[PDB]
């Protein structure tokens, strides 16, 4: 596993293992790749991110994974497949997020996106991503680099 400080100075730690921090994450993570762009979100308040969010009591984690595609970018998955997973240990909390990587098939329609102003898309992340107040905090630590890592020795883009 990986072990670093995130862009709050909260500790995150990061496995490429099944599930390893918890078996019920509470949240998902999904880095979305559309033909040969990366496919984000803009969130109201964090700025520009992979879409993602809560995994709610009556979902699995990728029952979450696919409507916060949805509901983010109006993207339909062609697959959906789990990643990793990271633990945020926080001040007060202490969240499991699960990585899945999702193919996007199409982008439909929508009048509106949720919490965020839907899909923008990216043929290359920016050199300048850290220092870049467009991104959310959640795009500024090690999870991205790391994950775009083993993703890329994956096969799977």
Same mark, same amino acid.
């Given at each position: 596993?990986? *072990? &670093?400080?995130?862009?709050?100075?909260?500790?995150?730690?990061?496995?490429?293992?099944?599930?390893? &921090?918890? %078996?019920?994450?509470?949240?998902?993570?999904?880095?979305? +790749?559309?033909?040969? /762009?990366?496919? !984000?979100?803009?969130?109201?308040?964090?700025?520009?991110?992979?879409?993602?969010? $809560?995994?709610?009591?009556? =979902?699995?984690?990728?029952?979450?994974?696919? +409507?916060?595609?949805? =509901? =983010?970018?109006?993207? +339909?998955? $062609?697959?959906?497949?789990?990643?990793?997973?990271?633990?945020? @240990?926080?001040? #007060?909390?202490?969240?499991?997020?699960?990585?899945?990587?999702?193919?996007? *098939? $199409?982008? #439909?329609?929508?009048? %509106?996106?949720?919490?965020?102003?839907?899909?923008? !898309?990216?043929?290359?992340?920016?050199?300048?991503?850290? +220092?870049?107040?467009? &991104?959310?905090?959640?795009?500024? %630590?090690?999870? @991205?680099?790391?994950?775009?890592?083993? @993703? /890329? *020795?994956?096969?799977?883009?």
């Amino acid at each position: 596993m990986y *072990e &670093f400080k995130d862009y709050y100075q909260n500790t995150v730690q990061l496995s490429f293992d099944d599930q390893p &921090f918890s %078996d019920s994450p509470k949240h998902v993570w999904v880095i979305c +790749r559309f033909g040969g /762009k990366w496919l !984000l979100t803009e969130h109201e308040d964090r700025g520009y991110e992979f879409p993602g969010g $809560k995994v709610e009591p009556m =979902e699995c984690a990728e029952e979450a994974a696919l +409507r916060e595609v949805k =509901e =983010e970018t109006g993207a +339909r998955v $062609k697959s959906l497949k789990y990643l990793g997973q990271y633990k945020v @240990l926080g001040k #007060e909390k202490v969240i499991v997020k699960n990585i899945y990587f999702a193919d996007i *098939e $199409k982008l #439909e329609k929508q009048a %509106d996106y949720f919490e965020t102003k839907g899909p923008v !898309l990216f043929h290359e992340l920016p050199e300048n991503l850290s +220092r870049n107040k467009k &991104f959310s905090f959640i795009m500024k %630590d090690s999870v @991205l680099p790391i994950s775009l890592k083993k @993703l /890329k *020795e994956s096969g799977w883009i």
